[PDB]
Structures are given as C-alpha cells and as structure tokens.
Scaffold this active site. Structure first.
Site, PDB file in Angstrom:
ATOM      1  N   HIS A 287       0.617  -0.985   0.074  1.00 17.22           N
ATOM      2  CA  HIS A 287      -0.170  -0.089   0.203  1.00 17.22           C
ATOM      3  C   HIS A 287       1.076   1.527   0.005  1.00 17.22           C
ATOM      4  CE1 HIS A 287      -2.516   2.850   1.904  1.00 17.22           C
ATOM      5  NE2 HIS A 287      -3.470   2.626   1.172  1.00 17.22           N
TER       6      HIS A 287
ATOM      7  N   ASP B  68      -6.167   2.373  -1.881  1.00 15.68           N
ATOM      8  CA  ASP B  68      -6.839   2.207  -1.044  1.00 15.68           C
ATOM      9  C   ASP B  68      -7.832   1.053  -1.185  1.00 15.68           C
ATOM     10  OD1 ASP B  68      -5.356   4.515   0.368  1.00 15.68           O
ATOM     11  OD2 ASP B  68      -7.068   5.591  -0.014  1.00 15.68           O
TER      12      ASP B  68
END
Ligand code: DAO
Length: 122
Positions: free
Chosen positions: A47, A89
């Site tokens: 991420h 996300d």
C-alpha cells in the site's frame, strides 16, 4: 485521504483501522516501511508503495468518492490520480481482509518498528 482509507479498511475487515492497523508490524500505520513480518504487514508495504505512483494528488489529504455496494468497493472519480488513489486504498482494504486468518495480535502495537530490516523494493 486517511478518511476514505479508514472507512474502506473498516468496511472490509470489520475492525477499527487505527487500533488494529495503526502501528501493525514493520509497515502498517505510523512511520515508514520495513521487511514485512507477515501477510497483513506486507499488504501495508504494498500500500505504501502504491502511494508513490500518485504525483498529482496527496494520498493523505485528498478526499475522493467511492461506492460501497454489494460488499464491494467501487472507485468512481473520473480524475485519474484520485481514481488511482482510491484503487490503492481499495487494494489494501481487500488485502487486509484476505489476511485476517493470520492477523497476529503480537504485531498490533509494534514498538519493534526500529528493529525492522530493509523494506521490500517497491
Ligand atoms: C484517523 C483516521 C484513520 C486512518 C486509517 C489508517 C490507519 C492504518 C492504515 C494502514 C495503511 C498503511 O499502513 O499503509
């Protein structure tokens, strides 16, 4: 932004994002990256890497639109940077949910972040 990111994690995982992932392992939450302790932690490393792809928008600050319909996340900005941000996300939320079966309590409040080894290359 942190706001949508938090909501997606909460939606996918059923967990409070800050308490559960805010300081988890070598990469989740506060501070930077480091060699992942486990699959949950690797989701956070991936991420953080993803955030590097956005030039024209601020991953932490810039709000965006998405839909939570049918137990799925759908990123609906036409703006490419905000679309890509939402996709970063979405992917971490999905990744963390996928790895709930190995979520480890012992890595939750990770004061050992300074013992982490070199991060994986993004
Ligand atoms: C206070 C608003 C909540 C912000 C949610 C994010 C907290 C942990 C998210 C983990 C993501 C990562 O570390 O890459």
């Amino acid at each position: 932004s942190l706001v949508e990111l938090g909501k997606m994690i909460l939606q996918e995982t059923g967990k409070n994002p800050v308490t559960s992932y805010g300081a988890y392992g070598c990469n989740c939450g506060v501070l930077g990256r480091g060699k992942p302790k486990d699959a949950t932690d690797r989701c956070c490393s991936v991420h953080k890497c993803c955030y590097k792809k956005m030039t024209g928008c601020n991953p932490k600050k810039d709000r965006y639109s998405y839909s939570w319909k049918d137990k799925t996340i759908v990123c609906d900005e036409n703006n490419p940077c905000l679309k890509e941000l939402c996709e970063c996300d979405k992917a971490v939320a999905i990744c963390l949910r996928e790895n709930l079966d190995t979520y480890n309590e012992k890595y939750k409040k990770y004061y050992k972040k300074p013992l982490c080894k070199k991060a994986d290359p993004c």
